[PDB]
Write a protein that binds this ligand. Structure first.
Ligand SMILES: Nc1ccc(N2C(=O)C=CC2=O)cc1
Ligand SMILES: [Cl-]
Ligand SMILES: [Cl-]
Ligand SMILES: [Cl-]
Ligand SMILES: [Cl-]
Ligand SMILES: [Cl-]
Ligand SMILES: [Cl-]
Ligand SMILES: [Cl-]
Ligand SMILES: [Mg+2]
Length: 346
């Protein structure tokens, strides 16, 4: 049952993998990644070797979280797991974890910065993002890091969501950085407990950028970005203010002069009126009032692609491990069980 493994050193790293994976080629270094040819399936794949997966309790739990999430995702518009393996023959010698996915080429950044996008292209790209998000949200998963570099696109304009947020550093979110430009204001500023509605804010920012060719909220820091956001959508009323938990944050918001919501038709000049309407329903400051993924799929902007019989939901997903307090070797044994129980896709 166990395949034969072979060892090789590539760019100062030892790779020990099943014989089915051939012609390994480093492509980046979380972990290190190689492209390879999978002779069993005929696909070009990415093989990721995790770095120090069990070095702390925090790191061991994150390894388990990533493997559980990738094993669950089975949807045309979401990255899935082709294989997971370890050269260890027993739990006692278990130390390394390797993950195998389809090799991705272009991301949405390349399409946006380069090509000329018709409204038809925007419809199809945003439709596929929302189709994947309906699936993800139906399992009570929040992506939390949706942005153009985390969306893979091929020559036929087909799209996959990848790089789920496995929980970023403060330094990574500081300054003039794309890592913050797509984040909802309530999570950027820790206003309140957040939920899946943060992802719809991100879709609105991405859709705006496809329509204009320009970043919607390219702030030079957290406060500059908040000012750009409030100039477009308006300052909050008393209803949303009650929902912000920090007294200082509430005090700061009330220090700002009040501003009305702008006319989106005079911002997104020449856009399809149905695109403008959908943007007004995503980019809502109060997260309770944003449109959901399931509701957006039925919006008239997507009439040529919407098929309610081909927009599936996910199997239920048990996340109770997230509140569990375990030792390193307990998280490690749980991860080992999930490696050896993996069943490949058809
Ligand atoms: N700045 C800016 C650039 C482009 C746009 N635009 C749309 O939003 C849809 C067509 C179009 O040219 C709007 C503002
Ligand atoms: Cl093999
Ligand atoms: Cl996939
Ligand atoms: Cl090992
Ligand atoms: Cl990006
Ligand atoms: Cl005022
Ligand atoms: Cl489950
Ligand atoms: Cl421990
Ligand atoms: Mg990424």
């Amino acid at each position: 049952e166990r395949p034969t493994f072979y060892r090789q050193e590539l760019n100062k790293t030892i790779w020990e993998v099943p014989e089915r994976y051939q012609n390994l080629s480093p492509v980046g270094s979380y972990g290190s990644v190689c492209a390879a040819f999978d002779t069993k399936t005929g696909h070009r794949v990415a093989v990721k070797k995790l770095s120090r997966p069990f070095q702390s309790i925090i790191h061991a739990k994150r390894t388990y979280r990533e493997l559980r999430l990738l094993k669950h995702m089975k949807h045309e518009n979401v990255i899935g797991l082709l294989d997971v393996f370890t050269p260890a023959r027993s739990l006692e010698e278990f130390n390394d974890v390797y993950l195998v996915t389809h090799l991705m080429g272009a991301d949405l950044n390349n399409i946006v910065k380069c090509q000329k996008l018709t409204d038809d292209h925007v419809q199809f790209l945003i439709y596929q993002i929302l189709r994947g998000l309906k699936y993800i949200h139906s399992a009570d998963i929040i992506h939390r890091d949706l942005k153009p570099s985390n969306l893979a696109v091929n020559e036929d304009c087909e799209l996959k969501i990848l790089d789920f947020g496995l929980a970023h550093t403060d330094d990574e979110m500081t300054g003039y950085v794309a890592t913050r430009w797509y984040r909802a204001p309530e999570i950027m500023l820790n206003w309140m407990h957040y939920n899946q509605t943060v992802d719809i804010w991100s879709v609105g920012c991405i859709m705006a950028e496809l329509l204009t060719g320009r970043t919607l909220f390219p702030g030079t820091d957290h406060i500059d970005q908040l000012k750009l956001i409030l100039r477009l959508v308006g300052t909050p009323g008393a209803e949303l203010l009650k929902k912000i938990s920090s007294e200082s944050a509430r005090n700061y918001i009330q220090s700002l002069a009040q501003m009305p919501k702008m006319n989106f038709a005079n911002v997104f000049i020449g856009a399809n009126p149905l695109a403008v309407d959908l943007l007004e329903k995503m980019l809502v400051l109060d997260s309770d009032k944003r449109i959901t993924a399931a509701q957006a799929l039925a919006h008239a902007y997507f009439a040529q692609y919407h098929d309610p019989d081909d927009e599936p939901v996910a199997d239920p997903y048990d996340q109770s491990f997230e509140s569990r307090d375990l030792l390193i070797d307990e998280w490690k044994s749980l991860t080992y069980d999930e490696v050896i129980s993996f069943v490949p896709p058809p």
